[PDB]
Amino acid sequence: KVFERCELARTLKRLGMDGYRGISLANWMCLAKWESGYNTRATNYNAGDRSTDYGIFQINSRYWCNDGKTPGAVNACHLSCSALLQDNIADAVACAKRVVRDPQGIRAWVAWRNRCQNRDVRQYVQGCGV
Ligand SMILES: [Cl-]
Ligand SMILES: [Cl-]
Ligand SMILES: [Cl-]
């Protein structure tokens, strides 16, 4: 599914993302916007390294989920990458929380550094009741 902005914001808040390991909801919104356009079914193959990015946060198969087809990969979220292509984003959120338990935190996603870091991101949550 493709979430509407405010629907997603409330969805993430219910799932405990607001301020998780220091990360405001608006930072998670900005991440989702630029990774996927709020689209849970998005996949992107990285021909360079044979990995794939899955779902609303575009979580990578090399480290985070298992797709069977990525050489040398591990699965720190202990999920099938399929779980990151559900309309229900609970598993994706659990996996995003796992990512940011690692030292880089949200810096793990380059798109965040590019499109969100050091920016005014207040617009993402404006009006949403969150
Ligand atoms: Cl911030
Ligand atoms: Cl699974
Ligand atoms: Cl679903």
Side-chain angles (χ1 to χ4, degrees):
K1 65 169 281 162
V2 179
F3 276 84
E4 185 260 323
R5 183 179 63 95
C6 289
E7 161 180 43
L8 179 58
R10 293 186 291 271
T11 299
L12 294 170
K13 195 176 183 181
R14 292 186 229 112
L15 288 164
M17 290 288 264
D18 192 28
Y20 187 82
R21 292 196 55 79
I23 304 164
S24 68
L25 185 56
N27 276 291
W28 293 120
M29 290 291 294
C30 185
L31 174 76
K33 187 277 178 181
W34 289 101
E35 292 290 353
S36 73
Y38 308 142
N39 178 13
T40 62
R41 92 178 307 273
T43 62
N44 174 71
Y45 179 60
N46 300 301
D49 86 339
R50 309 193 178 276
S51 69
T52 302
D53 301 312
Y54 291 88
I56 197 162
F57 300 122
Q58 289 289 279
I59 288 170
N60 189 263
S61 61
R62 175 151 300 285
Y63 295 110
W64 303 112
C65 62
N66 185 47
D67 67 6
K69 56 168 175 190
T70 308
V74 302
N75 181 7
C77 294
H78 56 254
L79 291 166
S80 171
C81 298
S82 171
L84 306 173
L85 303 177
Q86 294 176 91
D87 276 10
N88 185 290
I89 65 171
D91 290 327
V93 162
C95 188
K97 293 176 179 170
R98 174 60 186 87
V99 174
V100 307
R101 289 197 290 274
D102 272 13
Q104 294 183 263
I106 196 153
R107 289 158 168 64
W109 292 268
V110 197
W112 184 85
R113 299 178 217 136
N114 301 337
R115 310 285 186 159
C116 307
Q117 187 177 359
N118 299 331
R119 297 186 187 247
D120 179 355
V121 294
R122 292 175 290 168
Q123 70 184 99
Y124 296 99
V125 299
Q126 205 78 248
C128 305
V130 294

